[PDB]
C-alpha cells in the first residue's frame, strides 16, 4: 500500500461516514422549519449522495441555516474525496509511464 491508494481508500470510508452523519444531522436541523422536505432519514441519505456527487437534482434541499451548513460539509467532503481519487489515478499513470520510458 502506497500513500495514494491508502488516502483514496481513507477518503472512501470517510465519505461514507459523512453521508450517514449528514443524513442524521440534516433531519435534526430541518424538522421544525415549515415546508422542509429534508425530514426523514431514508431520503436524507439519497439527498446526501446527490449533494456529495454534486448532481443536485433539487427534489430535496435543506432550507435551514444548520441544514445548509451541514450541506456545505457534505459538498466539500464529496468534492475532495472524488478529487483525491483522480489525484491517486494520476499518480499511478505517471509512475507507469516513467517505468515504460525506461526511467
Amino acid at each position, epitope marked *: 500500500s502506497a500513500l495514494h491508494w491508502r488516502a483514496a481508500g481513507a477518503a472512501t470510508v470517510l465519505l461514507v461516514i459523512v453521508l450517514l452523519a449528514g443524513s*442524521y444531522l440534516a*433531519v*435534526l436541523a*430541518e*424538522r*421544525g*422549519a*415549515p*415546508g*422542509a*422536505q429534508l*425530514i*426523514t*432519514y*431514508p431520503r436524507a441519505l439519497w439527498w446526501s449522495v446527490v449533494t456529495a456527487t454534486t448532481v443536485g437534482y433539487g427534489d430535496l434541499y435543506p432550507v435551514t441555516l444548520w441544514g445548509r451548513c451541514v450541506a456545505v460539509v457534505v459538498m466539500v467532503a464529496g468534492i475532495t474525496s472524488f478529487g483525491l481519487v483522480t489525484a491517486a489515478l494520476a499518480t499511478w499513470f505517471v509512475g507507469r509511464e516513467q517505468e515504460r520510458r525506461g526511467h
Partner: antibody, heavy 118, light 108 residues
Framework: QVQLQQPGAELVKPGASVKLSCKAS????????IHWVKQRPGHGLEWIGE????????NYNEKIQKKATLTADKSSSTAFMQLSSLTSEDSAVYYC???????????WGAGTTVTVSS | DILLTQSPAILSVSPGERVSFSCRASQSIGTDIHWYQQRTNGSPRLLIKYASESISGIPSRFSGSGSGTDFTLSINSVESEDIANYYCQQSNRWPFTFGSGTKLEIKR
C-alpha cells in the same frame, strides 16, 4: 409486549400544570422520535410536538397556543410532556407514538385522559 | 402547513360491499400519506403507510392507492369489526398533519 406505557388519567386544577409520561420498550434506536397527539372528546387527532431523546431536540405545533415542553430521560427510556397553565380547552386524551424517522406512527400509547376541573 | 381534507365525514355502506375513503392534500405530497384506524375508545392503529404499502397484522381486505394530492383507503367486503374512525396523515413536509377523519357506518 406493550411498547409505549402511559398513565390512564390525571386531574389538574385550572391554571395548574401537569407532567405526562411515556416509558418506551422494544427496540429504542438513536434515530427514534417520540410524538405527542391530543384528541379532545369527539374531535380528531392534533399533532402537538416531537422530541428526539438521543439529542433531546424538540419541535412543537406553532399553529396552536404553546402549553407543552418535551423532555427525555435517556437512562429510564422515558419521554415527558409538561403541560402548564391549563384551562378547560386543554381537557383531552394525549397519546405518545414512536416514529422511526420515516414519517408514520408505528406504535401508540393507550393515552392519558387529562381532565382540567376544580 | 399541509391541509388534509377527508370528505365525506360519515360513510354508510351495506355489509359485504366495497368502501372508499378519500383524503385530498392542499399541495402535492408524492405518496407520503399513511392511514390509521381508531375504534371507539382505542388508540389509532397504522393500516397503510406510503399510500399503498401493507402493514402485517392487517386484513388483506384493506388497500390504499394514490399519488400527488388524491389518496384513497379501500375496504373490499366491509365487516362489523371495520366500524371505526379512519384518519390520513402526511410526512412530506414539516410538520406532520392529520385529516379531520371519516366514520364508517354499516346498514344491517
Amino acid at each position: 409486549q406493550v411498547q409505549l406505557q402511559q398513565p390512564g388519567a390525571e386531574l389538574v386544577k385550572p391554571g395548574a400544570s401537569v407532567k405526562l409520561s411515556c416509558k418506551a420498550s422494544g427496540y429504542t434506536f438513536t434515530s427514534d422520535w417520540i410524538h405527542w397527539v391530543k384528541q379532545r372528546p369527539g374531535h380528531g387527532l392534533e399533532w402537538i410536538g416531537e422530541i428526539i431523546p438521543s439529542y433531546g431536540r424538540a419541535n412543537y405545533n406553532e399553529k396552536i397556543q404553546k402549553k407543552a415542553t418535551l423532555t427525555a430521560d435517556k437512562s429510564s427510556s422515558t419521554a415527558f410532556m409538561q403541560l402548564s397553565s391549563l384551562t378547560s380547552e386543554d381537557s383531552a386524551v394525549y397519546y405518545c407514538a414512536r416514529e422511526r424517522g420515516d414519517g408514520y406512527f408505528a406504535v401508540w400509547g393507550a393515552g392519558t385522559t387529562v381532565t382540567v376541573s376544580s | 402547513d399541509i391541509l388534509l381534507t377527508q370528505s365525506p365525514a360519515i360513510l354508510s355502506v351495506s355489509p359485504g360491499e366495497r368502501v372508499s375513503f378519500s383524503c385530498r392534500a392542499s399541495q402535492s405530497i408524492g405518496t407520503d400519506i399513511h392511514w390509521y384506524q381508531q375504534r371507539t375508545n382505542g388508540s389509532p392503529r397504522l393500516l397503510i403507510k406510503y399510500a399503498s404499502e401493507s402493514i402485517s397484522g392487517i386484513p388483506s381486505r384493506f388497500s390504499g392507492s394514490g399519488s400527488g394530492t388524491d389518496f384513497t383507503l379501500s375496504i373490499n367486503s366491509v365487516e362489523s369489526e371495520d366500524i371505526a374512525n379512519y384518519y390520513c396523515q402526511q410526512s412530506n413536509r414539516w410538520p406532520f398533519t392529520f385529516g379531520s377523519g371519516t366514520k364508517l357506518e354499516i346498514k344491517r
